[PDB]
Amino acid sequence: REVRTIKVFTTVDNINLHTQVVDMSMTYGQQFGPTYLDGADVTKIKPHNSHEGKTFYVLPNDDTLRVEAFEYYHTTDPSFLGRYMSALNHTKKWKYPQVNGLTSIKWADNNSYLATALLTLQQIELKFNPPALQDAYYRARAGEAANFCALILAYCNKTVGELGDVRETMSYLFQHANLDSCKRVLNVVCKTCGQQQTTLKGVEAVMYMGTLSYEQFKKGVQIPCTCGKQATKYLVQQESPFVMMSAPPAQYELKHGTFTCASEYTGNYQSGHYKHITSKETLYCIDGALLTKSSEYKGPITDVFYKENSYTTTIKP
Ligand SMILES: Cn1ncc2c(Nc3ccccc3Cl)ncnc21
């Protein structure tokens, strides 16, 4: 019969704010359904004076919100916002030191794979299609990386605390990147079967699993033919700002100025730790918040990133 009310804003995207007047006697839950304040689940909290004028996230439960959510995130996955908020609640508590002019993450909750991915993303040319991802990437480049990390988690369907794979993370993120112009032309040659050429576009044009060396891919790599015998696969043409070469972790020597950055993986599928090696004026090894320099580097490398623009082979088949 006596009611206290505050004004708050609800949103799915943090750009379109929708005015609400809420009753302080009931929970946010009772009023909006699942509600979050800066990542924290406030579904079962009651509105408080300090809340007046703040923005709360809600799940998209009307047509306007569904459209906004889709336009912002480019996903219709009903669990997405929940998982993002959940992740954000953890990532907002992590530390993001500047290390050698790059935003890193101090180790917490098995986040070594995310630190490595975050560092990599700052050194290759990539534009994301979902406004959420692109906005968050710009802020992460500027030093505020908590949202970006939470979004990477939500898009890769990974929970805070779980061991992650960098190659898999890059692959999922790449699905949301504009890589439509990227083109790869391959040739596979059999002394018996002949020469078979393949054109790839998009994510598949910038990724390779089986060798770390971009040079080796240009020169030719041995693979089975349908004939049963050994054929040569080699890169004919590449049009992309970068390429990613991956392989199961093995001892490998990184030579200064022959690549942009690399992932080191110590461990197996059940446990392990990533470190990031970048080529600048010398070799930097970024391990979360820790930085070491060296002229040479030899370690279990699993991904290497190289710069590219437009490459044509000099091989005449
Ligand atoms: C021997 N081994 N252990 C892991 C692994 C791998 N993927 C992976 C999975 C989880 C975390 C990190 C990575 Cl690199 N790919 C190839 N060989 C691998």
Author numbering: 0 to 316
Show the paper's wording:
The main protease and papain-like protease (PLPro) are responsible for the cleavage of nonstructural proteins 4–16 and 1–3, respectively. PLPro cleaves the C terminus of ISG-15 (RLRGG) with sub-μM affinity allowing for the virus to delay the immune response, resulting in increased levels of infectivity for SARS-CoV-2 compared to other members of the coronavirus family. Although we were not able to obtain crystal structures with the NMR protein construct, the full-length protein (residues 1–314) containing two cysteine to serine mutations (C111S and C270S) did produce suitable crystals for X-ray diffraction with structures for 3 different protein-fragment complexes being solved.
The X-ray structures confirmed our NMR studies, showing class A fragments bound at the S4 subsite adjacent to the BL2 loop region, while class B compounds bound at a previously undocumented binding site in the finger region. Class A compounds share a similar binding pocket to other known SARS-CoV-2 PLPro inhibitors, GRL-0617 and the peptide-derived VIR-250.26 Like other inhibitors that bind to the S4 subsite, fragment 7 engages in π–π stacking interactions between their aromatic ring and Y268. Interestingly, the chemical structures of the class A fragments (e.g., 6 and 7) and class B fragment (e.g., 11) are similar in their primary structures, yet they bind to distinct sites on the protein based on the different NMR shift patterns and the cocrystal structures. Despite their structural similarity, the methyl group at N-1 is the key to the binding preference of the compounds.
